[PDB]
Design a protein around this ligand. Structure first.
Ligand SMILES: O=S(=O)(O)Oc1cc(O)cc(/C=C/c2ccc(O)cc2)c1
Ligand SMILES: O=S(=O)(O)Oc1cc(O)cc(/C=C/c2ccc(O)cc2)c1
Lengths: 116, 115, 115, 116
């Protein structure tokens, strides 16, 4: 599992469960091609998005659907989504964890990158 | 001034100076149309992007060119850029400040929406 | 004004208004001596805490009374208060801004140190 | 394990390893009594600080020695340490994860609180 997403809720002090995540990859013609998607589990984690073989070098966008999360909880938030855009695997395969901490009018995202 | 951008540097403990910022508005065909842009000042701020007349309700994207900022400082960063995507609403308060606090592998953004 | 405190609310997307802030200086016996205090203004800021003459090198603690803030808004918070502990140094720039961004179960603090 | 500490480094995009952590508990006479201490592992985690029996109700302070972390890496940071102060177990036993994301002039801390 070379791409994992972890989401926390800063209002409840809990994992952010059932958060939809869509990953895109920049194609040769410079558009955002859909790459993988999923939703966070009861632990606020999303595993199984892709494989080492399919997660080739490229520029990736991880869109975390924060508005859809907050609205399903009946709250009106500020952002449409949190976007995390990065070049991956350009020095060989790595494992990436994208973490996000959510509030209704704010979020903070960090990457943990490890070398198998 | 209905839209301001403030950028801080969490490594140096300073404003983030001369950071390029591009603002886009979502068009009817879901493409991102250029709207306004500039570079942050010595105080890490970018004022004068738009006017109340032009800043109508809709979805906007503020792209902060963090990669160039870190590279100019000789530091290797993670993100291509920081992105802040939000709906402008006339119901709420009138002035939007988008603030971003930058680290090489992490950022933190909030909205301060006031009258 | 060598020391300013700025407090933001990440739930409401606003300055955090009327938040009590207490600043202490570490004494020779390692106790915390009261130094200055106030409440944030309508812009979430607290100015006028000290003077350049009084703000000598040393270790300071800025305590932000976040628990009372959240309770006044009818929200149940995690932390008793937010604490920012740092050394003032004459070598670096002259003006310290301690900023804090508050959520019920989380905060984010940075220092903006300028001339 | 009812009290766990997780620390990340926002400069390196990695766990913050070998970070010293000291936990204190407010005593009846209102001073900070030493309660437990340890240091983060290669995964940036600190387990085994206390037990369910010993982690009674009280006000706790988790001091994360960020200055000692940054200086051991040869960098001069702003804060002395990050302090996380909270009432614990006042509605019965809970499990607490205190997470912190570190930069030289900034940090962000969050709590994840779960009910066994
Ligand atoms: O830089 S200043 O001295 O102007 O002080 C300010 C003024 C201001 O509007 C905002 C801020 C800080 C915002 C901020 C944003 C995200 C975080 O995770 C933490 C803090 C600091
Ligand atoms: O507390 S947990 O059990 O969720 O453990 C984890 C695991 C993990 O990959 C990340 C985190 C915290 C990340 C985090 C991210 C951004 C912030 O501004 C503050 C904290 C916490």
């Amino acid at each position: 599992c070379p791409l994992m997403v972890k989401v926390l809720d800063a209002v409840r002090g809990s994992p952010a469960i059932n958060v939809a995540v869509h990953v895109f990859r920049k194609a040769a013609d410079d558009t955002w091609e859909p790459f993988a998607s999923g939703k966070t589990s009861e632990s606020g984690e999303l595993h199984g998005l892709t494989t080492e073989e399919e997660f080739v070098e490229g520029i990736y966008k991880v869109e975390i659907d924060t508005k859809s999360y907050w609205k399903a909880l009946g709250i009106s938030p500020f952002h449409e989504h949190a976007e995390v855009v990065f070049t991956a695997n350009d020095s060989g395969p790595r494992r990436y964890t994208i973490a996000a901490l959510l509030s209704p009018y704010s979020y903070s995202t960090t990457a943990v990158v490890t070398n198998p």
